[PDB]
Design a protein around this ligand. Sequence first.
Ligand SMILES: CC(=S)N[C@H]1[C@H](O[C@@H]2[C@H](O)[C@H]3N[C@@H](C)S[C@H]3O[C@@H]2CO)O[C@H](CO)[C@@H](O)[C@@H]1O
Ligand SMILES: CC(=O)N[C@@H]1[C@@H](O)[C@H](O)[C@@H](CO)O[C@H]1O
Ligand SMILES: CC(=O)N[C@@H]1[C@@H](O)[C@H](O)[C@@H](CO)O[C@H]1O
Ligand SMILES: CC(=O)N[C@@H]1[C@@H](O)[C@H](O)[C@@H](CO)O[C@H]1O
Ligand SMILES: [Cl-]
Length: 528
Amino acid sequence: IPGTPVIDWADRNYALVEINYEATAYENLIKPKEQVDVQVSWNVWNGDIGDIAYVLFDEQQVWKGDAESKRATIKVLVSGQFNMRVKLCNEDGCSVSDPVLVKVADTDGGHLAPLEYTWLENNKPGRREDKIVAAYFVEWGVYGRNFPVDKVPLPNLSHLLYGFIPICGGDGINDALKTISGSFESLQRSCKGREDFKVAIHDPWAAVQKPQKSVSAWNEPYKGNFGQLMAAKLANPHLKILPSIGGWTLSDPFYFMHDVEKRNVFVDSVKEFLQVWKFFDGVDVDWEFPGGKGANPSLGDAERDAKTYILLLEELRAMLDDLEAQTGRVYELTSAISAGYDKIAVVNYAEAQKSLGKIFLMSYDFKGAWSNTDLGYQTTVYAPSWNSEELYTTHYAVDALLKQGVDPNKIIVGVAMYGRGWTGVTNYTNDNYFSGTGNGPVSGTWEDGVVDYRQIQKDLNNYVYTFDSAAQASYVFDKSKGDLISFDSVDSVLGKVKYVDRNKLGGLFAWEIDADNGDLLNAINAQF
Ligand SMILES: CC(=S)N[C@H]1[C@H](O[C@@H]2[C@H](O)[C@H]3N[C@@H](C)S[C@H]3O[C@@H]2CO)O[C@H](CO)[C@@H](O)[C@@H]1O
Ligand SMILES: CC(=O)N[C@@H]1[C@@H](O)[C@H](O)[C@@H](CO)O[C@H]1O
Ligand SMILES: CC(=O)N[C@@H]1[C@@H](O)[C@H](O)[C@@H](CO)O[C@H]1O
Ligand SMILES: CC(=O)N[C@@H]1[C@@H](O)[C@H](O)[C@@H](CO)O[C@H]1O
Ligand SMILES: [Cl-]
């Protein structure tokens, strides 16, 4: 037999998409690869080098050539781990080297181990399987909120909506980000060298760079939120993850997509974003809002956005159909819309529903601390008891879609895992505190005027709970400091379940998943 081969030592951790953990811009953050080249070299002891040389990736041939070269380069196209051996053969016999393990990494998670969700707080099995149970995961939730992916109750979720995927752009294209200090500049340095109207990542640190659970290794190819979501889909194979493009602050570049086809600069970037990051399962368009009303009041055009919103979905659906035939997968195209009738009337969803698979009806933020005069329910199914035709309700918004011809199976009702409130509510009659006028926003968890549902339960004995069984809404009041907060309790959410049940609505989605302590998500998945 030929000499025993000894594979020389080298790093055999390969990645089909390299990640530069020192970069800030998106174009220098990632390095997608056509292929990866597994290199192997060896030396020969105990005899000659043999006549022919083989390389084995499971005791099955993957390479052959000259044994004099003592080197082999193997093209690998798919991720995975395998043992590589060098097998020198000749007329006598064959010698087999000691195996080494090679790792080929890719965003499909083939190199990762399942990241199972350990049940925290009050979350308990199981999941509502015949209805859509979605939730929004915030990208910035790993900082002060301290809520990484390993805390997300994925076993009780059918969709995990990652918000938000930004659109590159400077002055005039993302002025809404200037409302938040440092948020606009973070997008500029993330789009360095990348020019406008292309998708990117707002913060590459928390997304793919920040060390987290099950992705804390020093040579970890993918960390952050993206790395955990790869391993999470293995522990939760039912789970489907969608990238949310836009949001409240990142919706400004949508208004400009009436032009030539910066849409293509958008869509073609979306098509590469989904094959670079394979753990996503479609696209979610969160244009807020078609026809103005957004974070930037300067933008808006009634029947320009109404057609642009249609053309955007038609071309995205056609682009996803190409991915479906090229990858063999199914890709979804969803969109979150406002629950305001004055805003639903702008877009004709009878035409949009043939490109959208589901519609996330944002049935919240009806009332807020932005107006001390217009006090009311932030989220509710029906009209309040003290005002029996508020048109900003979940019921009126659902019927508004139905009148247009929207299928009820495609309608997803929004659950608010938080609460907006006012402080120092004064000048009111009776014991109804919504007829009065507040004096400023209530003290909030992370932002004043908004309180997470979890903190509401902690401070529950500082308020007086009240459920409006006519409107299917809840609120709390504290006469000491005049704190009146409207939110979604277990009662109101359970009322939303039956409104979804045999009005034949698709399901429920919530914002945001980190603010729940297990009560709200369990009520969504209640089997009746
Ligand atoms: C108090 C909070 S959480 N405000 C964040 C805000 O608005 C979100 C969200 O962007 C908007 N899009 C749908 C998915 S839900 C709908 O309402 C939510 C809260 O009202 O979004 C911006 C970023 O766009 C955050 O900076 C705010 O903290
Ligand atoms: C970046 C890295 O992890 N490099 C190598 C790895 O390829 C190898 O599998 C391991 C043990 O052989 O030793 C590491 O130093
Ligand atoms: C990307 C991921 O994590 N898992 C996908 C899965 O969603 C898909 O159904 C399947 C079909 O090819 O391919 C896997 O790689
Ligand atoms: C400064 C501020 O809080 N603005 C809020 C925003 O947070 C919220 O997402 C949106 C809902 O439509 O309503 C705006 O008025
Ligand atoms: Cl390579």
